[PDB]
């Protein structure tokens, strides 16, 4: 069937908080380290003339 | 391009805008005419089981 | 694909199925979600002679 009393480590389940959507909210979002440059943009000429 | 994380539920990467130069009149303010890079980020969510 | 057989009148080859995946929502029973891999036989009968 289905299981109850799950002990969800997520979900606010705090005093009087509205019946919360997201069973998974209350988890921090960490950052990867993959900052993106938007490319070198090169050039041209510069010792052509 | 694969990258793997530990712990947290959501992984976010920041991106940057890149700028555009300008001329400066003699005896004139530079700080008066300047635009920031207005860099914004984007995020991918871990999914489920 | 010819192979040789002895004695018996007919010969059957078993044919396996192919699996599909899914999500296990948090706190969901695995059993009800399970669907079987069906495999079905297929028989070559000799005609002689």
From Swiss-Prot, chains B, C:
Location(s) in or outside the cell: Virion
Note on domains (UniProt): The N-terminus interacts with an internal region of the major capsid protein subunit in an adjacent capsomere (intercapsomeric interactions) to stabilize the capsid.
Assembly, per entry: Homohexamer. Interacts with the connector protein and the minor capsid protein. Interacts with the capsid assembly scaffolding protein; capsid proteins and scaffolding proteins form building blocks that assemble to form the procapsid, each hexamer of the major capsid protein interacting with 2 scaffolding proteins.
Homology family: Belongs to the T7virus major capsid protein family.
Function per UniProt: Assembles with the minor capsid protein to form an icosahedral capsid with a T=7 symmetry, about 60 nm in diameter, and consisting of 415 capsid proteins. The major and minor capsid proteins are incorporated into the capsid in about a 90/10 ratio respectively. Once the capsid is formed, encapsidates one single copy of the viral genome.
Protein name: Major capsid protein
Native species: Escherichia phage T7 (Bacteriophage T7)
Segment of the intact protein contained: 51 to 99 of 345
């Amino acid at each position: 069937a289905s299981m109850t009393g799950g002990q969800q480590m997520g979900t606010n389940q705090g005093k009087g908080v509205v019946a919360a959507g997201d069973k998974l909210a209350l988890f921090l979002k960490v950052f990867g380290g993959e900052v993106l440059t938007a490319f070198a943009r090169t050039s041209v000429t510069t010792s052509r003339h | 391009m694969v990258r793997s994380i530990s712990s947290g539920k959501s992984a976010q990467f920041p991106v940057l805008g890149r700028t555009q130069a300008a001329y400066l009149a003699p005896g004139e303010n530079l700080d008066d005419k300047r635009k920031d890079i207005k860099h914004t980020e984007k995020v991918i969510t871990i999914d489920g089981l």
